[PDB]
Amino acid sequence: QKTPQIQVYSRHPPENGKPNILNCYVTQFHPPHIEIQMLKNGKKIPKVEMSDMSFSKDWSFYILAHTEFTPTETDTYACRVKHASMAEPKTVYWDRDM
Amino acid sequence: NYTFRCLQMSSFANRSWSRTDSVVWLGDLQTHRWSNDSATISFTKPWSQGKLSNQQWEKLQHMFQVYRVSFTRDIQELVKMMSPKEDYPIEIQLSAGCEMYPASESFLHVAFQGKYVVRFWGTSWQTVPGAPSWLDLPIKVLNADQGTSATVQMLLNDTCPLFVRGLLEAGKSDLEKQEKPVAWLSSVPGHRQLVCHVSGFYPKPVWVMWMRGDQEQQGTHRGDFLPNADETWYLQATLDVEAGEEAGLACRVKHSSLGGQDIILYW
Ligand SMILES: CCCCCCCC(=O)N[C@@H](CO[C@H]1O[C@H](CO)[C@H](O)[C@H](O)[C@H]1O)[C@H](O)[C@H](O)CCCC(=O)NCCCCCCc1ccccc1
Ligand SMILES: *[C@@H]1O[C@H](CO[C@@H]2O[C@@H](C)[C@@H](O)[C@@H](O)[C@@H]2O)[C@@H](O[C@@H]2O[C@H](CO)[C@@H](O)[C@H](O)[C@H]2NC(C)=O)[C@H](O)[C@H]1NC(C)=O
Ligand SMILES: CCCCCCCCCCCCCCCC(=O)O
Ligand SMILES: *[C@@H]1O[C@H](CO)[C@@H](O)[C@H](O)[C@H]1NC(C)=O
């Protein structure tokens, strides 16, 4: 079993009030069964698109999730992953400054 | 040089549940998908048939349709034959294709539970050194099947480089596309980390550095290449700076799409 790594990043420079796309890239996991949610203020975002799962030279799996979002000064966004390698779901927050 | 990779992922949960899914890549662009749900292979580019005729493509597809069923049956029979020594769940991965040179070389590697165990080489299947010894007998049995051996030889020696030559021609405008990076600066927390974000560029090769005038800042820490959903790339590079020393810093980005005019952003 290999534990997923999660990276959360925007497609375009973030501007408050302006529509954008938020990406959640999940890598380095095995086995391939996984649940990926993207969250806005802690609530699941319904319209999340997923790439086809693939794998790297080292055999570990990866997949890209993305969703439309409009960042504001006060909204928080995150990506939460459930996988057999972890007893607890792993959450990574988007931080525009990070 | 382009590497063409056909990636198969098979999960066997028990005797009544399995799926096999595949994706195909030419370099970093996905050319095909074949979901367990679909009877046929799906094109993910307009040019994913390459220069093969409808007849040649359908012949090739039919062979794969037979293989997917046969493979699933073969693995299920092996697990029944070997129970309780080896048992569910089982993950099997195959990576097959070729790498093109100015000439070509083909490969077919197989992983079991995430570990490389078997390859096809020359005219036969072989276990790699350190592979579990219980694989030797089923590989012997598979090597007795000369029809399959000849088919794999044709696919690796002939079909792969042929097919790829046609993909490169048919997909030329996409493989040689240029998309410009857009960059932006931010920072996270007497030190702080400055972040230079670069997004939307294609092809993958890029140069990103923190600068003070024409002096490269060797503290520049480049992240990994991360995909965007629109077949462009994202990369960021960070710099740890002492508060006070932030003045005079810039991020410089070089990329093939910019026509010799680097992006320079000032902190
Ligand atoms: C990616 C490889 C290219 C696939 C080409 C296979 C041709 C094929 O479909 N042929 C199967 C049926 O063949 C029968 O009909 C053919 C004509 O249609 C011929 O006449 C052939 O002689 C005849 O037998 C055949 O059953 C084959 O065994 C299908 C499975 C192929 C297979 O275990 N390949 C090895 C890759 C997996 C090896 C994993 C080893 C392993 C085992 C357990 C755990 C981990 C790893
Ligand atoms: C197909 O080519 C192989 C040799 O090519 C290598 O293995 C392939 C599967 C592929 O991965 C290539 O990129 C590799 O370079 C032939 O096998 C050789 O055959 C000769 C005699 O004719 C034999 O003496 C060699 O030992 C074999 N080579 C090896 C490395 O084992 C094979 O015969 C070709 N088959 C057809 C149908 O064309
Ligand atoms: C399996 C290696 C084949 C090498 C020859 C390449 C021929 C073109 C392949 C077209 C798409 C194949 C998609 C299915 C892949 C699979 O099931 O392994
Ligand atoms: C995968 O495809 C096979 C063949 O059509 C089918 O029988 C099987 O139920 C599918 N598996 C899943 C999990 O849907």
Residue numbers in the entry:
A (entry chain B): 2 to 99
B (entry chain A): 7 to 108, 111 to 197, 202 to 279
What is the paper's account of this structure, in its own sentences?
Invariant natural killer T-cells (iNKT-cells) are a small set of glycolipid reactive T-cells that bridge innate and adaptive immunity. Whereas conventional T-cells are activated by peptide antigens presented by MHC proteins, iNKT-cells typically recognize glycolipid antigens presented by MHC class 1 like CD1d molecules on antigen presenting cells. Structural data illustrated that the lipid chains of α-GalCer are bound in two hydrophobic pockets deeply buried in CD1d5, 6. The larger A’-pocket binds the fatty acid part while the linear F’-pocket accommodates the phytosphingosine chain.
To gain insights into the poor antigenic potency of the glycolipids but high affinity TCR binding, we determined the crystal structure of the CD1d/5d-complex as well as that of the complex of CD1d with compound 23, which resembles 5d but lacks the amide group. Surprisingly, galactosylsphingamide 5d is presented less well ordered by CD1d, as judged by the less contoured electron density. This slight disorder of the galactose presentation correlates well with the increase in the H-bond distance between CD1d and 5d. Especially the 2”-OH interaction with CD1d Asp153 is increased compared to 23 (3.0 vs. 2.6 Å), while the 3’-OH of phytosphingosine is also less intimately contacted by CD1d Asp80 (3.1 vs. 2.5 Å). We next compared the precise presentation of both ligand headgroups by CD1d. As suggested by the changes in hydrogen bond distances, the galactose of 5d is slightly elevated compared to 23, correlating with the increased distance in H-bonding interactions with CD1d. Notewhorthy, the computationally modelled hydrogen bond between the amide oxygen and Tyr73 was not observed in the glycolipid/CD1d crystal structure. When looking down into the binding groove of CD1d (TCR view), we noticed lack of the F’-roof closure by 5d, while 23 induced the F’-roof formation. This is likely the result of the amide group perturbing the hydrophobic nature of the F’-pocket in general. Since the only difference between both glycolipids is the presence (5d) or absence of the amide group, this indicates that the amide is indeed responsible for the slight elevation of the galactose but more importantly for the failure in closure of the F’ roof in the binary complex, the latter of which is likely the main reason for the low antigenicity of the α-galactosylsphingamides. Biological evaluation revealed that the novel α-galactosylsphingamides are weak iNKT-cell antigens and that the main compromising factor is the implemented amide functionality.
